[PDB]
Amino acid sequence: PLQQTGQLFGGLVRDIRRRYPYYLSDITDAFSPQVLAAVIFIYFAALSPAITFGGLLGEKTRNQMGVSELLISTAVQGILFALLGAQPLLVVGFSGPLLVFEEAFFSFCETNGLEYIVGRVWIGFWLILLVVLVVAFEGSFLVRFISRYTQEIFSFLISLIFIYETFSKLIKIFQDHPLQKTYNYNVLMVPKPQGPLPNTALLSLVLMAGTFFFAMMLRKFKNSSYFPGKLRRVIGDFGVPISILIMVLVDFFIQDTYTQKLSVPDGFKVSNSSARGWVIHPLGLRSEFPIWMMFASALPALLVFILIFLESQITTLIVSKPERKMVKGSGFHLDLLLVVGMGGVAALFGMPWLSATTVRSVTHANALTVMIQEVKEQRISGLLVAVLVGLSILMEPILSRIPLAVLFGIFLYMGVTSLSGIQLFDRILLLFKPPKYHPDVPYVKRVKTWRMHLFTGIQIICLAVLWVVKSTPASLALPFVLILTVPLRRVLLPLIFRNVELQCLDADDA
Template identity: 25%
Template sequence: MEESFVPFGGIKNDIKGRLKCYKQDWTSGLSAGFRILAPTTYIFFASAIPVISFGEQLERDTDGVLTAVQTLASTALCGIIHSIIGGQPLLILGVAEPTVIMYRFMFDFAKNRPDLGSQLFLAWTGWVCVWTAILLFLLAILGACSIINRFTRLAGELFGLLIAMLFMQQAIKGLVDEFHIPERENPKSVDFQLSWRFANGMFAMVLSFGLLFTALRSRKARSWRYACGSLRGFVADYGVPLMVLVWTAVSYIPAGTIPKGIPRRLFSPNPWSPGAYENWTVVKDMLKVPVLYIIGAFVPATMIAVLYYFDHSVASQLAQQKEFNLRKPPSFHYDLLLLGFLTILCGLIGIPPANGVIPQSPMHTKSLATLKHQLLRNGLVTTARQFIHKNASLGQVYERMQEAYQQMQTPLVYQEPSARGLKELKESTIEMASNMENINAPVDESVFDIEKEINDLLPIEVKEQRLSNLLQATMVGGCVAAMPLIKKIPTSVLWGYFAFMAIESLPGNQFWERMLLLFTALSRRYKGVPCHFCRNRTIQNNCHVHDIPNHILVCLFRDYLGSGRRGSFPIDDHAFGSCETICFAQVFQRGTPSRFGCRRVRRIPGCTIQPYNRRRAG
């Protein structure tokens, strides 16, 4: 993204770039056929379940003024609009926990004001949304999103790691609460007796850990040695949603022998219940809010605008990481402008606004990367086998595969063509054939293992389209009408899914993967940082990652001692200087060769190079 602080300059560039590929966004999704349902259902559950949980939390915090019906409606409405006219279709919108927290603070403020109260709470939040939208308009028009380029990958990954920790914290907190009496419940009820509370908590742990374990295992079903390939693929694509249904069914096994409230299930009013639709006409009450509170709404609006600016932009940035090899331009400025309009819309109809969410957005991109890999793999395997059966030579097979590969690519290429995988495939296969002295002979699968080679070397690409986002948002909207069925899901299944989302968002986070090296045995560090969505073998084999733990510890140690806290340690200045010098020398001596190369390092006086130890375990 080019930096553009000219008013309307960034928005103009975003609209121009996305209009060029708007038609292809739809045709690409339709061309995937029924396969698009796999990432759609995967991201639908990842989007709907947290929103339902946040809706329950809002209901407790706002005394029933806002419920899961409103959070689902907001997520569906904003998601549908963004998928149709938004800039970046990979970005998933939803009601996030920071929004829930801000609404709780605003409700606590409003209910204690006699001239505002809970009756005008939604009308006042409407003014908060208006101020928030104005600030978002200014940020988008003035090109504030250009600062996103200054955000390093570390900043985005730290934020993503924080969100993952919050999801895990929510899962643990929810499991602990299963052993306690919920708020606003009758403590004298039979199912809240000590023995039944303990039984409910233990059963909740079984359901939560059962869902977590089976969901994680189902994501790796393609590498199983059991069952046929189509069944393994089905489990990998739809296993997580199926596990939610399976463990919900398991929760009904002891029905009839235990109190009705065990296990605890979701609670939310139906959308057709009396009073459930009063918030939709909140716009008529906005003029009843005193002028002082209309002006004062600017204060929480400022905090929400800053929060949305950072959260929305980072979510979009994480969904467009470099290793995904996206071929279409970003749209940070225009998406922020559209978010302002969506915020006003949500405020006028009395529902909490939605914004770009983490980890759902990068999870969406990863699921589409898996889909694109399957489509390319199946097409190339079919082409290769077709010409191998015609006794074609290796060169002919490669040429046909290259033609098929180019035909499956989008013509809107904004990056270098990602044909590296096929180039490596050609080189490795020709080398193997040369060793067998039959390079011009017809190719058979003893020389050319079609599925293995293509699966390992095919470059990572993403099926960039709008259909999956539109379908998942529509399905979230369908949850509003299906609320009686959703209320049958145990809350413990939600906590297990929260933990699954936290763990599922960690692969690909380079900060997390490098932190794991602190606990990796020295003899195993030659494997380097795992690159789940980057199959560049050269990078994996040549990364000098065995010193990364030392670098992390030295940086943390030096920053801590150098930030004015030396008095906290019984270390004098001479000892501190010696320690710092030794640590820096260790980092420079061992870390510099991998950055600057051996020839340049040899010219530095007093610097020696230690050979890289590639010994294997065992």
């Protein structure tokens, strides 16, 4: 599949030919209650990150893009990906890297006095052109260069960003509402409290901690040895939704204290009507968009493409791993083109660009599998999940009751659980464990301990450089510095290390 045919659009046409004949089979292959249960699993698996990321983005962007835009974008793009995608199992949704880039671009626009929502439109135009070119000359083969080194650095950095953002937002909540001897009660809160309030900071902290604790405990219960087993797994799958429900109820029955809630408009309306409308005028909303930025918003498009490409193609090669028995065709070229073109069109509409995310796609595959006898592949479950996510915006009364601290707890849970599968995290943990306790894994046995620690130290240096670039005003360059790790692994590490050490420390498929 990832072979340079040498013909224009060769990969895309090959994938579309591969997957077209199966269409009716996918439509009529669901025909069962297994799909009706996978729909319920993935609806929540997609809604929880959707609302968390929408809340964070609405807070940072001042609701230029928020929960409503994210929900509608996820729904519509999921419908399109279900009808047209080469791999319907892949679930398109806002991810951590996309949020990081969006924060960076919003900060850049604020510093440069530009309209963020219009710079995004121009970035979308450039992304469409870029993907047309990249798919013309097969560039999906570049995913081969993306080694475990860069994937691990990327995932670890995103998890660290999630954790730090959660705790920084909690610190901000405390700063806004400090623990005081006395409060000027009767403060006005039309948009938000104009002064410190009692019990707000501590209650938000308690809500966050409780949501995190309940999610973690249900995760542990999923893998426990309690209850009839099938029910144990059913409850474990519904862990994050149950924790959200529990903490939302706990907050709901405490009526006197104030905690900030999700900002959701009543119906299908933008989060901030005054700031923007449904359609974004490319030339400008309130003021002229600078000409130089129209041409200069191609490096940001390249960085966004780098992020989406890395995430989506890693997901595609994870799902297409032959161990999972992914019968039928999975197309890198078509998936990437569809995802990023839909993202650019959304950017025109003011809605976020999405990327095929690893966790939710893998969970969908696991839900739709049978025993490993086979995997039930359909485009009906994804379509129903997408339409349910779209209708979720209609449920404003429920959503407006959700505290933001609960979503911060879910954010922290997401980061901590994403930390699990990374071998960089395992080696960082081994930095503390004595050598006598080092597991029996290829890189522990076939590499001297101090050389393993040197490898992990170089990875940590790369992480520190990436974080410094995140904090500096040149935040947008972070994807480029991340891609710089590929040359580091393919050029410098061979000088620093021998081939067997790099084989063990960077093995793909383990």
